[PDB]
Coordinates of N, CA and C (backbone and C1' of nucleotides) in Angstrom, one line a residue:
Chain A
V1 N 25.0 -30.9 -52.2 CA 24.4 -30.2 -51.2 C 24.2 -31.2 -50.0
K2 N 24.7 -30.8 -48.8 CA 24.7 -31.7 -47.6 C 23.8 -30.9 -46.6
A3 N 22.8 -31.7 -46.1 CA 21.9 -31.2 -45.1 C 21.9 -32.0 -43.8
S4 N 22.2 -31.5 -42.6 CA 22.3 -32.2 -41.4 C 20.9 -32.2 -40.8
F5 N 20.8 -32.9 -39.7 CA 19.5 -33.0 -39.0 C 19.2 -31.6 -38.3
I6 N 18.0 -31.4 -38.0 CA 17.5 -30.1 -37.3 C 17.2 -30.5 -35.9
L7 N 18.2 -30.1 -35.0 CA 18.1 -30.3 -33.6 C 18.0 -29.1 -32.8
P8 N 17.1 -29.1 -31.7 CA 16.9 -28.0 -30.8 C 18.3 -27.8 -30.1
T9 N 18.7 -26.5 -30.0 CA 19.9 -26.1 -29.3 C 20.0 -26.7 -27.9
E10 N 21.2 -27.0 -27.4 CA 21.4 -27.8 -26.3 C 21.2 -26.9 -25.0
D11 N 21.5 -25.6 -25.0 CA 21.2 -24.8 -23.9 C 19.8 -24.6 -23.7
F12 N 18.9 -24.6 -24.7 CA 17.6 -24.5 -24.5 C 17.0 -25.6 -23.8
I13 N 17.5 -26.9 -24.1 CA 17.0 -28.1 -23.5 C 17.5 -28.1 -22.0
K14 N 18.8 -27.7 -21.8 CA 19.3 -27.7 -20.5 C 18.5 -26.7 -19.5
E15 N 18.2 -25.6 -20.1 CA 17.3 -24.6 -19.3 C 16.0 -25.1 -19.1
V16 N 15.3 -25.7 -20.1 CA 13.9 -26.1 -20.0 C 13.8 -27.5 -19.3
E17 N 14.7 -28.4 -19.7 CA 14.7 -29.8 -19.2 C 13.3 -30.5 -19.0
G18 N 12.4 -29.9 -18.2 CA 11.1 -30.4 -18.0 C 10.1 -30.0 -19.2
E19 N 8.9 -30.2 -18.9 CA 7.7 -29.8 -19.8 C 7.8 -30.6 -21.1
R20 N 6.5 -31.0 -21.5 CA 6.5 -31.8 -22.7 C 6.9 -31.1 -24.0
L21 N 6.5 -29.8 -24.1 CA 6.7 -29.0 -25.3 C 6.2 -29.7 -26.6
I22 N 5.3 -30.7 -26.4 CA 4.6 -31.4 -27.5 C 3.2 -31.5 -27.2
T23 N 2.3 -30.8 -28.0 CA 0.9 -30.7 -27.9 C 0.3 -31.6 -28.8
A24 N -0.7 -32.5 -28.3 CA -1.4 -33.5 -29.1 C -2.9 -32.9 -29.3
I25 N -3.2 -32.7 -30.5 CA -4.6 -32.1 -30.8 C -5.3 -32.9 -31.8
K26 N -6.7 -33.1 -31.6 CA -7.5 -33.9 -32.3 C -8.3 -33.1 -33.4
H27 N -8.4 -33.6 -34.6 CA -9.1 -33.0 -35.6 C -10.1 -34.0 -36.2
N28 N -11.3 -33.5 -36.6 CA -12.3 -34.4 -37.1 C -12.7 -34.0 -38.5
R29 N -12.8 -35.0 -39.4 CA -13.2 -34.9 -40.8 C -14.7 -35.2 -40.8
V30 N -15.5 -34.2 -41.3 CA -17.0 -34.3 -41.3 C -17.4 -34.8 -42.7
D31 N -18.3 -35.8 -42.7 CA -18.9 -36.4 -43.8 C -20.4 -36.6 -43.4
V32 N -21.2 -35.5 -43.7 CA -22.6 -35.5 -43.4 C -23.3 -36.5 -44.4
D33 N -24.6 -36.8 -44.0 CA -25.4 -37.6 -44.8 C -26.0 -36.9 -46.0
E34 N -27.1 -37.4 -46.6 CA -27.6 -36.8 -47.8 C -28.3 -35.5 -47.6
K35 N -29.2 -35.5 -46.6 CA -29.9 -34.3 -46.4 C -29.3 -33.4 -45.2
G36 N -29.3 -33.9 -44.0 CA -28.9 -33.2 -42.9 C -28.1 -34.1 -41.8
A37 N -28.3 -35.3 -42.0 CA -27.7 -36.3 -40.9 C -26.3 -36.3 -40.9
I38 N -25.6 -36.6 -39.7 CA -24.2 -36.7 -39.5 C -23.8 -38.2 -39.8
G39 N -24.7 -39.0 -40.4 CA -24.5 -40.3 -40.7 C -24.9 -41.3 -39.7
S40 N -24.8 -42.6 -40.1 CA -25.2 -43.7 -39.1 C -24.1 -44.2 -38.3
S41 N -22.9 -43.5 -38.4 CA -21.7 -43.9 -37.6 C -21.8 -43.3 -36.2
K42 N -22.8 -42.6 -35.8 CA -23.0 -42.1 -34.5 C -22.0 -40.9 -34.1
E43 N -22.3 -40.2 -33.1 CA -21.5 -39.0 -32.9 C -20.4 -39.3 -31.8
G44 N -20.2 -40.6 -31.5 CA -19.0 -40.9 -30.6 C -17.7 -40.4 -31.3
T45 N -17.6 -40.6 -32.6 CA -16.7 -39.7 -33.5 C -17.6 -39.1 -34.4
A46 N -17.3 -37.8 -34.6 CA -18.2 -37.0 -35.5 C -18.4 -37.6 -36.9
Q47 N -17.3 -37.9 -37.6 CA -17.2 -38.9 -38.6 C -15.9 -39.7 -38.4
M48 N -14.9 -39.0 -38.0 CA -13.6 -39.6 -37.7 C -12.9 -38.6 -36.8
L49 N -12.1 -39.1 -35.8 CA -11.2 -38.2 -35.0 C -9.8 -38.7 -35.1
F50 N -9.0 -38.0 -35.8 CA -7.5 -38.3 -35.8 C -6.8 -37.3 -35.1
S51 N -5.5 -37.7 -34.8 CA -4.7 -36.9 -33.8 C -3.4 -36.5 -34.5
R52 N -2.9 -35.3 -34.1 CA -1.6 -34.7 -34.7 C -0.9 -34.1 -33.6
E53 N 0.4 -34.3 -33.6 CA 1.3 -33.7 -32.6 C 2.0 -32.5 -33.1
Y54 N 2.2 -31.4 -32.3 CA 2.9 -30.2 -32.7 C 3.9 -29.9 -31.7
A55 N 5.1 -29.5 -32.3 CA 6.2 -29.3 -31.4 C 6.5 -27.7 -31.3
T56 N 7.5 -27.3 -30.4 CA 7.8 -26.0 -30.2 C 9.2 -25.8 -29.6
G57 N 10.1 -25.1 -30.1 CA 11.4 -24.9 -29.6 C 12.2 -24.1 -30.5
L58 N 13.5 -23.8 -30.1 CA 14.5 -23.2 -30.9 C 15.4 -24.2 -31.4
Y59 N 15.6 -24.3 -32.7 CA 16.4 -25.4 -33.4 C 17.6 -24.9 -34.0
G60 N 18.7 -25.7 -34.2 CA 19.9 -25.4 -34.9 C 20.0 -26.1 -36.2
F61 N 20.5 -25.5 -37.2 CA 20.7 -26.1 -38.5 C 22.0 -25.8 -39.1
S62 N 22.5 -26.6 -40.1 CA 23.7 -26.5 -40.7 C 23.6 -27.1 -42.1
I63 N 23.8 -26.3 -43.2 CA 23.7 -26.6 -44.6 C 25.0 -26.3 -45.2
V64 N 25.5 -27.2 -46.1 CA 26.8 -27.1 -46.9 C 26.4 -27.2 -48.4
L65 N 26.8 -26.2 -49.2 CA 26.7 -26.1 -50.5 C 28.0 -26.1 -51.3
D66 N 28.3 -27.2 -52.0 CA 29.6 -27.2 -52.7 C 29.3 -26.9 -54.2
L67 N 28.9 -25.7 -54.4 CA 28.6 -25.2 -55.7 C 29.7 -25.1 -56.7
Chain B
rA1 C5' 34.9 -41.4 -54.1 C4' 35.0 -40.5 -53.0 C3' 33.6 -40.5 -52.1 O3' 33.6 -41.5 -51.2 C1' 34.5 -38.3 -52.5
rU2 P 32.5 -42.8 -51.3 O5' 33.1 -43.9 -50.5 C5' 32.4 -44.4 -49.4 C4' 33.3 -44.6 -48.0 C3' 32.4 -45.0 -46.8 O3' 33.3 -45.7 -46.0 C1' 33.5 -42.8 -46.6
rU3 P 32.8 -47.2 -45.5 O5' 31.4 -47.3 -46.1 C5' 31.0 -48.1 -47.2 C4' 29.5 -48.2 -47.4 C3' 28.7 -48.9 -46.4 O3' 27.4 -48.3 -46.3 C1' 28.5 -49.9 -48.5
rG4 P 27.1 -47.0 -45.4 O5' 26.6 -45.9 -46.5 C5' 26.9 -44.6 -46.1 C4' 27.5 -43.8 -47.4 C3' 26.4 -43.5 -48.4 O3' 25.8 -42.2 -48.2 C1' 28.3 -44.6 -49.4
rA5 P 24.4 -42.1 -48.8 O5' 24.5 -41.9 -50.3 C5' 25.3 -40.8 -50.9 C4' 25.4 -41.0 -52.4 C3' 24.2 -41.2 -53.2 O3' 23.5 -40.0 -53.5 C1' 25.8 -42.8 -53.9
rA6 P 22.5 -39.3 -52.4 O5' 21.1 -39.2 -53.2 C5' 21.0 -38.7 -54.5 C4' 20.0 -39.3 -55.4 C3' 18.7 -39.6 -54.7 O3' 17.8 -38.6 -54.8 C1' 19.5 -41.6 -55.8
rA7 P 17.7 -37.4 -53.6 O5' 16.2 -37.7 -53.0 C5' 15.2 -38.0 -53.8 C4' 14.3 -39.0 -53.1 C3' 13.6 -38.6 -51.9 O3' 12.3 -39.2 -51.8 C1' 15.0 -40.5 -51.5
rG8 P 11.0 -38.3 -51.8 O5' 10.6 -38.0 -50.3 C5' 11.5 -37.3 -49.5 C4' 10.8 -36.8 -48.2 C3' 9.9 -37.7 -47.5 O3' 9.9 -37.4 -46.1 C1' 8.8 -35.7 -48.2
rU9 P 11.1 -38.0 -45.2 O5' 10.3 -38.6 -43.9 C5' 9.6 -39.8 -44.1 C4' 8.2 -39.6 -44.5 C3' 7.3 -38.7 -43.6 O3' 6.4 -38.0 -44.4 C1' 6.4 -40.9 -43.9
rU10 P 5.7 -36.6 -44.0 O5' 4.8 -36.2 -45.1 C5' 5.3 -35.4 -46.2 C4' 4.6 -35.8 -47.4 C3' 3.2 -35.6 -47.6 O3' 2.8 -34.3 -47.9 C1' 3.7 -37.8 -48.4
rG11 P 2.0 -33.4 -46.8 O5' 0.6 -33.0 -47.6 C5' 0.7 -32.5 -48.9 C4' -0.1 -33.3 -49.8 C3' -1.7 -33.4 -49.5 O3' -2.4 -32.3 -49.8 C1' -0.8 -35.6 -49.9
rU12 P -2.8 -31.2 -48.7 O5' -4.3 -31.4 -48.5 C5' -5.3 -31.1 -49.5 C4' -6.5 -32.0 -49.3 C3' -7.1 -31.9 -47.9 O3' -8.1 -30.8 -47.7 C1' -6.8 -34.2 -48.5
rA13 P -8.1 -30.1 -46.4 O5' -8.9 -31.0 -45.4 C5' -10.3 -31.2 -45.6 C4' -10.9 -31.9 -44.4 C3' -10.8 -31.2 -43.1 O3' -12.1 -31.5 -42.3 C1' -9.7 -33.4 -43.0
rG14 P -13.3 -30.5 -42.3 O5' -13.1 -29.8 -40.9 C5' -12.0 -28.9 -40.7 C4' -12.0 -28.1 -39.5 C3' -12.3 -29.0 -38.2 O3' -11.5 -28.3 -37.1 C1' -14.0 -27.3 -38.4
rU15 P -11.0 -29.3 -35.9 O5' -11.9 -29.0 -34.7 C5' -12.4 -30.1 -33.8 C4' -13.9 -30.0 -33.7 C3' -14.4 -29.2 -32.4 O3' -15.5 -28.6 -32.7 C1' -15.2 -31.5 -32.3
rA16 P -15.6 -26.9 -32.6 O5' -16.9 -26.5 -33.5 C5' -16.8 -26.7 -34.9 C4' -18.0 -27.4 -35.5 C3' -19.2 -27.0 -34.8 O3' -19.8 -25.8 -35.2 C1' -19.1 -29.4 -35.1
rU17 P -20.6 -24.8 -34.2 O5' -22.1 -25.3 -34.2 C5' -22.8 -25.2 -35.5 C4' -23.9 -26.2 -35.5 C3' -25.0 -26.2 -34.4 O3' -25.9 -25.1 -34.6 C1' -24.3 -28.4 -34.9
rG18 P -25.7 -23.8 -33.7 O5' -27.0 -23.8 -32.7 C5' -28.3 -23.4 -33.2 C4' -29.3 -24.3 -32.6 C3' -29.5 -24.1 -31.1 O3' -30.2 -23.0 -30.7 C1' -29.4 -26.4 -31.6
rC19 P -31.3 -22.9 -29.5 O5' -30.6 -23.7 -28.3 C5' -31.4 -24.5 -27.4 C4' -30.9 -24.6 -26.1 C3' -30.4 -23.2 -25.5 O3' -30.8 -23.0 -24.2 C1' -28.7 -24.9 -25.3
rG20 P -32.2 -22.4 -23.8 O5' -31.8 -21.1 -23.0 C5' -31.0 -20.1 -23.7 C4' -30.8 -18.9 -22.7 C3' -30.2 -19.2 -21.3 O3' -29.4 -18.2 -20.9 C1' -32.3 -18.1 -21.1
rG21 P -27.8 -18.5 -20.6 O5' -27.7 -19.1 -19.1 C5' -27.6 -18.1 -18.1 C4' -28.8 -18.4 -17.0 C3' -28.9 -17.3 -16.0 O3' -30.3 -17.3 -15.6 C1' -28.2 -19.4 -14.9
rU22 P -30.9 -15.9 -15.2 O5' -32.5 -16.1 -15.4 C5' -33.0 -16.3 -16.8 C4' -34.1 -17.4 -16.7 C3' -35.1 -17.2 -15.6 O3' -36.0 -16.2 -15.9 C1' -34.3 -19.5 -15.7
rC23 P -36.2 -15.0 -15.0 O5' -37.5 -15.1 -14.2 C5' -38.8 -15.3 -15.0 C4' -39.6 -16.4 -14.3 C3' -39.9 -16.1 -12.8 O3' -41.1 -15.3 -12.6 C1' -39.1 -18.4 -13.1
rC24 P -40.8 -13.8 -12.2 O5' -41.3 -13.7 -10.7 C5' -42.7 -14.1 -10.4 C4' -42.8 -14.5 -8.9 C3' -42.2 -13.6 -7.9 O3' -43.0 -12.5 -7.5 C1' -41.5 -15.9 -7.5
rU25 P -42.4 -11.1 -7.2 O5' -41.7 -11.2 -5.9 C5' -42.4 -11.6 -4.7 C4' -41.6 -11.7 -3.5 C3' -40.9 -10.4 -3.1 O3' -40.8 -10.3 -1.7 C1' -39.3 -12.0 -3.5
rU26 P -41.8 -9.3 -0.8 O5' -41.0 -8.0 -0.6 C5' -40.6 -7.2 -1.7 C4' -40.2 -5.9 -1.2 C3' -39.0 -5.7 -0.2 O3' -38.2 -4.6 -0.3 C1' -41.0 -4.7 0.7
rG27 P -36.8 -4.8 -1.0 O5' -35.8 -5.2 0.2 C5' -35.1 -4.3 1.0 C4' -35.9 -4.2 2.4 C3' -35.7 -2.9 3.2 O3' -36.8 -2.8 4.0 C1' -34.7 -4.6 4.4
rC28 P -37.5 -1.3 4.3 O5' -38.9 -1.5 4.8 C5' -39.9 -2.1 4.0 C4' -40.8 -3.1 4.7 C3' -41.2 -2.6 6.1 O3' -42.3 -1.8 6.1 C1' -40.4 -4.9 6.2
rG29 P -42.2 -0.3 6.7 O5' -43.0 -0.4 8.1 C5' -44.3 -0.9 8.1 C4' -44.6 -1.6 9.4 C3' -44.3 -0.9 10.7 O3' -45.3 -0.1 11.1 C1' -43.3 -3.0 10.9
rG30 P -45.0 1.5 11.2 O5' -44.7 1.8 12.8 C5' -45.7 1.5 13.7 C4' -45.1 1.4 15.1 C3' -44.3 2.5 15.6 O3' -45.0 3.6 16.0 C1' -43.2 0.5 16.0
rC31 P -44.5 5.2 15.8 O5' -43.2 5.2 16.6 C5' -43.3 5.0 18.1 C4' -42.0 5.4 18.7 C3' -41.4 6.8 18.5 O3' -40.7 7.1 19.7 C1' -39.9 5.1 17.7
rU32 P -41.4 8.0 20.8 O5' -40.6 9.4 20.7 C5' -40.4 10.0 19.5 C4' -40.4 11.5 19.4 C3' -39.0 12.1 20.0 O3' -38.6 13.2 19.2 C1' -40.8 13.0 21.2
rG33 P -37.6 12.9 18.0 O5' -36.1 13.3 18.6 C5' -35.9 14.6 19.0 C4' -34.9 14.6 20.3 C3' -34.3 15.9 20.7 O3' -35.1 16.6 21.5 C1' -32.6 14.2 20.6
rA34 P -36.1 17.8 20.8 O5' -37.3 18.0 21.9 C5' -38.4 17.1 21.8 C4' -38.7 16.5 23.2 C3' -38.7 17.5 24.3 O3' -39.9 18.3 24.5 C1' -37.5 15.6 25.0
rG35 P -39.7 19.8 25.1 O5' -39.6 19.6 26.6 C5' -40.7 19.2 27.4 C4' -40.3 18.7 28.7 C3' -39.6 19.8 29.7 O3' -40.6 20.7 30.2 C1' -38.4 17.9 29.7
rA36 P -40.5 22.3 30.1 O5' -39.4 22.7 31.2 C5' -39.7 22.8 32.6 C4' -38.5 23.0 33.4 C3' -37.9 24.3 33.2 O3' -38.5 25.5 33.7 C1' -36.2 22.6 33.3
rG37 P -38.5 26.9 33.0 O5' -37.0 27.4 33.0 C5' -36.4 27.8 34.2 C4' -35.0 28.3 34.0 C3' -34.9 29.7 33.2 O3' -33.8 30.4 33.6 C1' -33.7 27.9 32.0
rC38 P -34.0 31.5 34.8 O5' -34.0 32.9 34.0 C5' -34.9 33.2 33.1 C4' -34.6 34.6 32.5 C3' -33.2 35.0 32.2 O3' -33.2 35.8 31.1 C1' -34.2 36.4 33.8
rA39 P -32.9 35.1 29.6 O5' -31.3 35.4 29.4 C5' -30.9 36.6 28.6 C4' -30.5 37.7 29.5 C3' -30.6 39.1 28.9 O3' -31.0 40.0 30.0 C1' -28.4 38.6 29.6
rC40 P -32.3 40.7 30.0 O5' -32.7 40.8 31.5 C5' -31.9 41.5 32.5 C4' -31.6 40.6 33.7 C3' -30.9 41.3 34.9 O3' -32.0 42.0 35.6 C1' -29.8 39.2 34.4
rU41 P -32.1 43.6 35.6 O5' -31.3 44.1 36.8 C5' -31.7 43.6 38.1 C4' -30.5 43.5 38.9 C3' -29.6 44.7 39.1 O3' -29.9 45.5 40.1 C1' -28.3 42.8 38.5
rU42 P -30.6 47.0 39.7 O5' -29.5 48.0 39.9 C5' -28.8 48.2 41.1 C4' -27.5 49.0 40.9 C3' -27.5 50.1 39.9 O3' -28.0 51.3 40.5 C1' -25.6 48.8 39.6
rC43 P -28.8 52.2 39.7 O5' -27.9 53.0 38.6 C5' -26.9 53.8 39.2 C4' -26.2 54.6 38.1 C3' -27.0 55.3 37.0 O3' -26.3 56.6 36.6 C1' -25.6 53.7 36.0
rA44 P -26.3 57.7 37.6 O5' -26.6 59.0 36.5 C5' -27.8 58.9 35.7 C4' -27.9 60.1 34.9 C3' -26.8 60.3 33.8 O3' -27.3 61.0 32.7 C1' -26.8 62.1 35.4
rG45 P -27.8 60.1 31.4 O5' -26.7 60.3 30.3 C5' -26.6 61.4 29.5 C4' -25.5 62.4 30.0 C3' -25.5 63.8 29.5 O3' -25.2 64.7 30.5 C1' -23.4 62.8 29.0
rG46 P -26.2 65.8 30.9 O5' -25.7 66.2 32.4 C5' -25.5 65.2 33.4 C4' -24.1 65.3 34.0 C3' -23.5 66.7 34.0 O3' -24.0 67.5 35.0 C1' -21.9 65.1 33.3
rA47 P -24.6 69.0 34.6 O5' -23.6 70.0 35.4 C5' -23.2 69.8 36.7 C4' -21.7 69.9 36.8 C3' -21.1 71.2 36.4 O3' -21.2 72.2 37.4 C1' -19.9 69.4 35.3
rG48 P -21.9 73.6 37.1 O5' -20.6 74.6 36.7 C5' -20.9 75.8 36.0 C4' -19.6 76.3 35.4 C3' -19.9 77.2 34.2 O3' -20.1 78.5 34.7 C1' -18.3 75.5 33.6
rU49 P -21.6 79.2 34.7 O5' -21.7 80.2 33.5 C5' -20.7 81.1 33.2 C4' -20.4 81.3 31.8 C3' -21.5 81.9 31.0 O3' -21.0 82.8 30.0 C1' -21.0 79.8 30.1
rU50 P -21.0 84.3 30.3 O5' -22.0 84.9 29.2 C5' -23.4 84.6 29.3 C4' -24.3 85.7 28.7 C3' -24.0 86.0 27.1 O3' -25.2 86.4 26.6 C1' -23.6 87.9 28.3
rG51 P -26.2 85.2 25.9 O5' -25.5 84.8 24.5 C5' -26.1 85.1 23.2 C4' -25.5 86.4 22.7 C3' -26.4 87.3 22.0 O3' -26.0 88.7 22.2 C1' -24.7 86.8 20.5
rC52 P -25.8 89.3 23.7 O5' -24.2 89.1 24.0 C5' -23.3 89.0 23.0 C4' -21.9 89.3 23.5 C3' -21.4 90.7 23.1 O3' -21.8 91.7 23.9 C1' -19.8 89.0 22.7
rC53 P -23.2 92.5 23.5 O5' -22.6 94.0 23.3 C5' -21.8 94.7 24.2 C4' -20.4 94.8 23.7 C3' -20.3 95.9 22.6 O3' -20.2 97.2 23.1 C1' -19.1 93.9 22.0
rC54 P -21.5 98.2 23.1 O5' -21.1 99.2 21.9 C5' -20.3 100.4 22.2 C4' -19.9 101.2 20.9 C3' -21.1 101.5 20.0 O3' -21.7 102.7 20.4 C1' -19.2 100.6 18.7
rG55 P -23.2 102.7 20.9 O5' -23.9 103.5 19.8 C5' -23.5 104.7 19.2 C4' -23.6 104.8 17.7 C3' -25.1 105.2 17.3 O3' -25.0 106.0 16.1 C1' -24.5 103.1 16.4
rC56 P -24.8 107.5 16.1 O5' -26.2 108.1 15.6 C5' -27.4 107.9 16.3 C4' -28.5 108.9 15.9 C3' -29.1 108.7 14.5 O3' -30.5 109.1 14.6 C1' -28.2 110.9 14.8
rG57 P -31.5 108.3 13.6 O5' -31.3 108.9 12.2 C5' -31.9 108.3 11.0 C4' -31.4 109.0 9.8 C3' -32.3 110.1 9.2 O3' -31.5 111.2 8.7 C1' -32.0 108.5 7.5

RNA sequence: AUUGAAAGUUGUAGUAUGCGGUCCUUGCGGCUGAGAGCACUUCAGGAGUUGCCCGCG
């Protein structure tokens, strides 16, 4: 089984050319204290703030099966 | 079947929690659509005319 890379189609890129089409979003993992506190790490970060990037577009694929 | 062959950059994670666009406020006071004004002035229902005609309780 041969699998190629997943690339967005070239006409879509040519038409769009601009715009990031990549959105960076922040998620927080909550670790509260024993009774009700958010912990001694302060609320500058809730407990932690990590970041994730999400893409968007029309992609092309090609798969070969030599069964 | 190519220095290629086997291969997750993988798994778990809430920007969340409480926070009144709030309390007081006259569209308010005074103000003649009023005073003057002939549906008035001239005017015949008017001029002609046999209850008509015959009569033995």
